[PDB]
Structures are given as C-alpha cells and as structure tokens.
Ligand SMILES: Cc1cn([C@H]2C[C@H](O)[C@@H](COP(=O)(O)OP(=O)(O)O[C@@H]3C[C@](C)(N)C(=O)[C@@H](C)O3)O2)c(=O)[nH]c1=O
Ligand SMILES: Nc1ncnc2c1ncn2[C@@H]1O[C@H](CSCC[C@H](N)C(=O)O)[C@@H](O)[C@H]1O
C-alpha cells in the first residue's frame with residue numbers, strides 16, 4: 288500500500304511485471320552478471336486517479352554521466368521539437384526579454400532552435416554526457432535535476448521564465464510535487480508549464496505495456512493531470528494529442544484562473560470519463576491483455592525457432608527491457624538487437640543480455656525476422672530498411688497485438 292506521490296492517497300496495484308533491471312544500463316559483454324533490480328508494478332491512486340509505479344528507483348541510478356539515450360537519433364523527433372520551439376517563439380516568447388527553461392534537454396534537440404533564435408534559455412540536464420552534447424551546440428545547460436531548490440536558484444539569478452517545458456521527462460520524476468513547487472517559484476505569472484508524456488489512453492488502447500519501466504513513473508491522463516495541477520495552484524488549460532512515442536498528450540498548465548481552458552480540455556476529460564479510462568476494471572483488463580500478449584509473443588518466438596527461422600531485434604529501446612525480462616526473451620530467441628546509438632553498441636541489453644550491434648550491421652544476408660522494439664519509430668525505420676523487406680524479411684510487432692508483416 289504505497290502512498291500516492293501527488294496527493295498522498297492510497298495506490299491500488301493492477302499490474303505486476305515482476306523483477307526488472309535498470310532499462311538504460313547497457314553492460315560490456317565481460318562485465319559481472321550482477322545488476323540492480325527492483326519490482327516493477329503499477330497502480331492507481333484512489334483519491335486523484337494518478338496511475339503510477341509502486342517502487343521508485345533512485346534518480347541517480349538512472350540519470351548520470353553515462354546515461355545513453357540520445358534524443359537527436361530520430362529525424363521525426365528532431366522535426367517534432369524544432370516545430371514546437373518555433374511555435375513557442377511565435378506565441379509565448381514574444382517579449383522584450385523572454386526566457387525559456389527546458390527540463391530534461393538531453394542533447395539539445397529542442398533548445399538548439401531557441402538558441403539559434405537568440406532567445407535566453409536554460410536546459411536542466413542532470414546526465415552530463417548528453418548535457419555536453421547540448422553545450423557543444425551553444426545551448427546553456429545546467430547539469431542538475433530540476434526541483435524546488437534548483438528552480439529557486441535559477442529564479443534568483445535569471446528571473447522568471449515565460450515557458451517551462453518538459454518532454455518525456457515529467458513522467459520520469461516521482462518527486463513531482465517538488466518540480467511543481469519549483470515551477471511555482473520560477474514561472475512568470477502569465478507563463479506556461481508545458482509537458483508531454485506517454486498517454487494512459489494510448490497505453491490502454493494499444494496494450495503498450497513496454498511503456499512501463501523504471502524511468503516512467505507516471506502514466507499521465509487528462510483526468511489525473513487536471514487533479515494534479517489543481518492541487519498545486521495551477522490549472523490545465525490546454526491538451527493536444529501527439530503521435531510520437533506511441534501516443535502522447537501535451538499538457539499546458541497556467542496559474543489558476545489566468546487563462547480560460549480550451550474546449551479541448553473538457554472534451555478529452557469527457558472522453559476519458561466515457562471510456563472509463565482510469566477505472567480499476569479497465570486498468571485490470573489492460574493487465575490481463577498484457578499477459579495475453581506475453582503468451583502470444585513467446586509462443587511465436589519459440590515456434591520461429593523450432594522452424595529454424597532466425598530472429599533479431601531492432602532498436603535497443605529502454606522499453607524493450609520490460610519486454611525481454613517480463614517475457615523471458617533472450618539471445619536464444621532473439622540473437623542480436625540493432626541500434627544507432629554508439630553508447631549502446633557492442634554491449635548487452637539489461638537483464639536479458641542480448642548483444643547490441645550497430646544498425647549498419649543489419650544488412651544482407653538479413654535475418655528472417657526482426658522484432659520491432661522501436662515500434663514507435665516504425666515509419667522512420669522501415670523507410671531506411673526497405674531492402675530488408677524487399678528481400679522477404681519481416682517485422683514482428685507486439686503493439687497493439689502480436690502480428691508479422
Ligand atoms: C529512430 C531510430 C531509432 N533507433 C534506435 C535508437 C534508440 O536507442 C531506440 C529508439 O528508442 P526510443 O523509442 O526513441 O526511446 P526509448 O524507448 O529507448 O526511451 C528513451 C528513454 C526515455 C527518456 N525514458 C524515454 O521516454 C524516451 C523518450 O527515450 O532505437 C534506431 O536504431 N534507428 C532509428 O532509425
Ligand atoms: N529532475 C530532472 N530535471 C531535468 N532533467 C531530468 C530530471 N530527471 C531526469 N532528467 C533527464 O530527462 C531526460 C529524459 S530523455 C528525453 C529528453 C528529451 N526531452 C526528449 O523528449 O527526447 C534525461 O536526459 C534525464 O537526464
């Protein structure tokens with residue numbers, strides 16, 4: 288009976304994905320087979336309806352000097368964030384001396400556009416290796432976690448921020464109340480705090496359980512986000528659904544009563560209520576479909592082997608740690624995983640220990656099948672791998688169901 292991180296209410300578990308490793312730790316082949324593990328389980332608060340994990344992994348075990356995810360490895364996402372930056376430049380950052388703070392800037396994928404507009408800005412990036420990649424682009428970055436105190440410090444030296452933005456970061460931070468206190472300290476009275484994160488609605492519709500892993504503490508909805516803002520003096524004033532990362536919502540929070548919520552907020556709220564998205568029964572039905580997908584995927588993977596078909600994976604996603612460890616999938620079933628990230632190549636996946644090789648190594652002679660872990664990048668990947676499919680190689684997907692095509 289863990290206490291909700293937003294409100295302190297009681298959290299009821301609906302899904303247990305068992306013992307899991309750190310999702311973003313990629314070991315050299317000769318490293319000790321010891322890994323940090325934790326119990327990955329998800330529940331819903333009874334008071335505010337926030338869906339959240341039941342065990343926190345300490346921040347510093349996940350985010351540090353060698354954290355390996357590089358945002359700019361995706362062309363879709365480079366475009367996606369450059370367009371978002373231009374939109375803030377045309378709307379919220381038209382003053383004499385605007386200021387935008389990004390929480391979790393990573394390699395600078397969004398802030399580069401703000402820096403090239405000459406606008407004052409600051410990225411928080413506690414993972415110093417990717418922080419340095421953003422600094423190389425001329426971005427101003429602080430290697431610190433955003434929380435109340437570091438926000439107070441930026442308020443004291445730099446003044447208020449017109450925009451605070453976080454993408455695929457806010458749902459990573461169990462200490463969201465501290466973040467929100469920092470937002471309260473730092474945001475201009477007429478500013479916005481905008482964040483976008485994997486949306487509970489899409490996870491349930493797609494049964495995309497690999498969206499649940501150490502770094503995703505919260506599975507936000509419009510319902511839980513509205514409650515969360517309210518309990519903090521903010522108000523959810525816009526929502527926009529996004530296709531990226533398997534389905535997200537971008538939430539816009541403002542000081543309460545400062546702006547009138549768009550019709551979009553009330554409409555999404557009513558669709559979630561109508562679909563009973565956060566009801567414990569809907570969430571338990573999702574958990575039972577997760578089990579059906581495990582059972583189908585392992586049966587397929589085993590049949591492929593019995594039929595002497597070769598199988599690899601494509602994309603060394605954090606998400607895949609859930610898949611391989613919950614389903615029991617290792618190198619006997621999926622021999623290698625191909626990935627464009629240097630820091631992940633010539634390493635082994637967490638827990639399951641499948642070797643990671645450069646994507647340039649996925650080439651003729653192709654394997655018979657590629658299990659598509661980077662399924663949120665399907666179009667971008669398939670576009671670069673038409674020869675594989677032309678050769679008769681096929682993709683195994685497990686979202687929204689197990690199928691080959
Ligand atoms: C586009 C492309 C990617 N790839 C490779 C690169 C990446 O390792 C991985 C994709 O990881 P991708 O789905 O983006 O994020 P991941 O689940 O890891 O999750 C990471 C961690 C984090 C912050 N917790 C999160 O939520 C998201 C935003 O990022 O796949 C190719 O090989 N070829 C390609 O053409
Ligand atoms: N409290 C916090 N403040 C700011 N960044 C944080 C943080 N906790 C984690 N992070 C950073 O959040 C980043 C998530 S990776 C995704 C970053 C990028 N916005 C994108 O959408 O692709 C990591 O680089 C991690 O170091």
Ligand SMILES: [Zn+2]
Pocket residue numbers: 291292293294295296332333334335336337
């Ligand atoms: Zn709660």
